[PDB]
Amino acid sequence: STKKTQLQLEHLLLDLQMILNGINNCKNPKLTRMLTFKFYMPKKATELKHLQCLEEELKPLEEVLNLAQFHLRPRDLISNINVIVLELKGFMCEYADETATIVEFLNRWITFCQSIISTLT
Numbered sequence: 001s002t003k004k005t006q007l008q009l010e011h012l013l014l015d016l017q018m019i020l021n022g023i024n025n026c027k028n029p030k031l032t033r034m035l036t037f038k039f040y041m042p043k044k045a046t047e048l049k050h051l052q053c054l055e056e057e058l059k060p061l062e063e064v065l066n067l068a069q070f071h072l073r074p075r076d077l078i079s080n081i082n083v084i085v086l087e088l089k090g091f092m093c094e095y096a097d098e099t100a101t102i103v104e105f106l107n108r109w110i111t112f113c114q115s116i117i118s119t120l121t
């Protein structure tokens with residue numbers, strides 16, 4: 001049961017890294033524009049239930065990805081992430097006051113994933 005949970009988080013980790021790596025390969029003027037979009041960050045993210053904070057931001061994530069343009073369709077990878085987040089989290093999300101770019105948003109959730117995987121090894 002703990003192994004199944006770990007596997008899901010690892011798939012989530014790799015999905016998120018995929019988006020970040022895809023974004024990091026955008027051309028600089030396009031990327032500059034993409035970094036103007038605001039993403040909302042959890043006040044605290046240490047537990048699986050805090051993934052609610054990720055779930056709520058998945059639609060804006062999908063939109064920004066759609067607005068940029070690839071071998072992957074945004075609706076497919078976001079759907080995969082959605083399924084995993086929904087099955088993992090199984091509470092109202094508390095948001096931090098300061099917003100973030102798509103990059104720092106992705107970095108934060110990548111770090112969350114890696115932190116939780118580390119408690120399951």
Ligand SMILES: *SCCC(=O)N1CCc2c([nH]c3ccccc23)C1
Pocket residue numbers: 018019022023025026027030065066068069070072073074075077
């Ligand atoms: S900005 C040039 C790169 C690009 O086309 N992107 C927009 C669509 C996209 C990117 N990364 C991902 C991952 C998954 C789905 C779509 C996607 C960056």
